[PDB]
Amino acid sequence: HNFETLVTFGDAYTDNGRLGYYINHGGKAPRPGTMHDETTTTASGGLSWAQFAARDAGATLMDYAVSGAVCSNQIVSRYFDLINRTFPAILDDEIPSFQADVLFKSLYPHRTAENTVYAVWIGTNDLGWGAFLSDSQTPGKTISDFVSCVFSVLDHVYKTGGRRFVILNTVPLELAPLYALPENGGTLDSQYWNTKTKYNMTEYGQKIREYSTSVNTMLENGALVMASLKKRWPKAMVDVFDVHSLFNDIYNAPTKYLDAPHNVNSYYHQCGPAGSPCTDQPGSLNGYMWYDELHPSNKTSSIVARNFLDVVAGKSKYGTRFH
Numbered sequence: 001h002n003f004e005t006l007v008t009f010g011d012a013y014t015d016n017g018r019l020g021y022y023i024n025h026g027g028k029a030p031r032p033g034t035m036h037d038e039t040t041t042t043a044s045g046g047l048s049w050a051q052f053a054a055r056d057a058g059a060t061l062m063d064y065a066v067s068g069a070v071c072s073n074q075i076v077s078r079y080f081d082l083i084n085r086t087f088p089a090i091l092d093d094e095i096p097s098f099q100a101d102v103l104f105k106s107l108y109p110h111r112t113a114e115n116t117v118y119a120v121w122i123g124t125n126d127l128g129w130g131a132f133l134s135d136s137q138t139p140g141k142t143i144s145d146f147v148s149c150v151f152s153v154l155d156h157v158y159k160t161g162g163r164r165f166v167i168l169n170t171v172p173l174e175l176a177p178l179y180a181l182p183e184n185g186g187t188l189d190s191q192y193w194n195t196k197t198k199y200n201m202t203e204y205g206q207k208i209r210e211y212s213t214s215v216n217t218m219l220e221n222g223a224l225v226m227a228s229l230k231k232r233w234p235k236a237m238v239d240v241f242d243v244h245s246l247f248n249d250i251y252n253a254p255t256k257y258l259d260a261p262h263n264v265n266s267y268y269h270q271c272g273p274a275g276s277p278c279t280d281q282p283g284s285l286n287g288y289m290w291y292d293e294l295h296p297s298n299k300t301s302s303i304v305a306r307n308f309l310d311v312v313a314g315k316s317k318y319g320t321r322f323h
């Protein structure tokens with residue numbers, strides 16, 4: 001592997017302990033020059049993709065992702081009672097933490113353009129219930145403004161000297177049990193959407209498919225325009241990792257990717273809409289695409305990580321490379 005350090009921005013799909021730091025510190029971020037304590041039990045039920053990727057590459061992981069995060073709280077935000085403030089966002093919280101940290105040799109002893117890879121995986125929350133899916137954003141903002149936010153994340157990284165960028169696109173959120181119909185293994189009222197069954201679930205599910213696929217088109221063509229034509233990031237490399245297609249591939253051929261029982265339309269950890277009580281399914285978590293109705297399992301996460309390392313090597317059916 002041709003990198004020593006992996007720096008990640010995102011939400012619970014990536015978070016390896018940083019929301020936990022905020023909860024344990026009254027809603028304060030780690031002091032600059034410090035990182036949160038790492039956990040090996042994430043929203044996946046185990047390691048996140050970033051942990052699998054760093055461990056296989058022999059790289060240091062600097063994981064700024066925060067469970068619950070959106071790209072920009074100026075676009076859309078959600079209040080988190082346990083910290084008495086909004087869930088942290090990438091531009092508002094994660095990037096400012098990273099901008100201060102790179103000044104400390106104790107955290108970044110030898111960060112170069114060549115030896116550090118920067119990845120962003122964001123949009124599951126921005127496009128979902130309580131955000132764009134319920135038209136809860138800042139009035140007038142659109143999903144085009146979310147896509148611009150992702151490129152603004154890369155601008156901030158670029159200005160610190162970063163040059164090797166990976167955008168992970170949005171998953172097929174209509175196949176997450178939170179958004180799927182119950183006839184297809186979807187939740188009834190969920191801990192993440194406790195009034196789901198009062199809405200037209202068919203219409204909301206199709207809407208989130210429209211939003212996710214549209215964001216994915218805009219991220220791929222926007223990355224090519226900005227990188228290759230407008231030279232927005234001179235001497236940078238920008239990969240788009242089509243994790244939407246990888247998730248469709250797992251869903252369509254689970255005997256190729258999962259252990260028994262090769263389950264893609266249900267979820268391992270099944271909680272009532274209060275968030276408790278919860279029962280775990282029988283069998284291995286390695287037999288389930290989804291740990292809960294919104295979060296991919298640690299097995300799915302390990303598949304994302306192996307394909308991510310192929311994208312960074314520039315040899316993936318799921319990677320498109322722009323410079």
Ligand SMILES: *[C@@H]1O[C@H](CO)[C@@H](O[C@@H]2O[C@H](CO)[C@@H](O[C@@H]3O[C@H](CO[C@H]4O[C@H](CO)[C@@H](O)[C@H](O[C@H]5O[C@H](CO)[C@@H](O)[C@H](O)[C@@H]5O)[C@@H]4O)[C@@H](O)[C@H](O[C@H]4O[C@H](CO)[C@@H](O)[C@H](O)[C@@H]4O)[C@@H]3O)[C@H](O)[C@H]2NC(C)=O)[C@H](O)[C@H]1NC(C)=O
Pocket residue numbers: 200202203206
């Ligand atoms: C909750 O939310 C859901 C999702 O929005 C709502 O369900 C949608 O309702 C609309 C009606 O307003 C449905 O459209 C009708 O669909 C029927 C059946 O065909 C559809 O499904 C077929 C089976 O798979 C599919 O093959 C069809 O596709 C072909 O035909 C359409 C023609 O519309 C064409 O566009 C395609 O290219 C294909 O050739 C189609 O998807 C259909 O018979 C209806 O026809 C009437 O309307 C058309 C105008 O489009 C007109 O030509 C006809 O003369 C006639 O007037 C109409 O298309 C839609 O399928 C539902 N979508 C889903 C995903 O379920 C639901 O109503 C909401 N409920 C509430 C309470 O709000």
Ligand SMILES: *[C@@H]1O[C@H](CO)[C@@H](O[C@@H]2O[C@H](CO)[C@@H](O)[C@H](O)[C@H]2NC(C)=O)[C@H](O)[C@H]1NC(C)=O
Pocket residue numbers: 045046047283284285286298299302
């Ligand atoms: C995902 O996490 C689960 C839960 O920790 C791992 O499975 C456990 O693995 C241990 C050791 O093999 C077993 O004793 C447990 O019975 C397993 N529990 C469950 C719930 O399956 C699993 O190995 C992890 N997978 C990956 C890819 O890391």
Ligand SMILES: *[C@@H]1O[C@H](CO)[C@@H](O)[C@H](O)[C@H]1NC(C)=O
Pocket residue numbers: 084
């Ligand atoms: C929560 O934050 C608000 C707004 O910043 C503040 O005024 C209030 O003191 C806080 N409330 C609690 C219960 O901590």
